[PDB]
């Protein structure tokens, strides 16, 4: 099936399949299934087909792939435009939470 605009694999468990959405981790995937009435030990196949569209409607209760992408982009751009410490450490490629960019800025500076 294709839930939330992405063709989730059919031959995987429902939790893992719905975890592929950009905006859900390993907890919201269980929570949505618990709140909508879907088991955590079945594949996309061997499941109600109307439940697919019910889940497609349910995943709109919070942020989604495009919504999360645009939210992150607008937050970063707002920080850059405001120009605080957050923006200064964001549009330079360095950690902003006070990490030492001396010997362990190694996936902010990239490989050397």
């Amino acid at each position: 099936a294709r839930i939330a605009g992405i063709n989730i694999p059919d031959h995987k468990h429902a939790v893992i399949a719905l975890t592929s959405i950009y905006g859900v981790g390993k907890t919201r995937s269980k929570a949505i299934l618990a709140a909508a009435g879907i088991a955590e030990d079945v594949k996309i196949s061997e499941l109600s087909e109307g439940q697919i569209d019910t889940l497609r409607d349910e995943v709109a209760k919070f942020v989604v792939e495009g919504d999360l992408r645009r939210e992150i982009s607008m937050s970063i751009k707002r920080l850059m435009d405001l120009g605080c410490y957050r923006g200064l450490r964001h549009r330079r490629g360095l950690p902003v939470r006070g990490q030492r960019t001396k010997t362990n800025a190694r996936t902010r500076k990239g490989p050397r």
Binding site: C84, Y85, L88
Partner: protein, 83 residues
Amino acid sequence: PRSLKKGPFIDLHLLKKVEKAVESGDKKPLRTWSRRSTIFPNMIGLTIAVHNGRQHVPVFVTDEMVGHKLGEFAPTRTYRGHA
């Protein structure tokens, strides 16, 4: 952080100075020496020269800074590249 019910930490004197500025209607910058003080919504529309030891750096406080510390806008180190 601080407890939700304790309240902000605006200074005795800073509040008096901003009250003077807001009913006098003066455009001159108000210099402040405090660095761990919070921000109040009544300062929107004023220029605050905050002191960090080097220069009284100006802040033209927007309507987008109330719930944080005014000192986040003024770093103290001087570095924009190794070379």
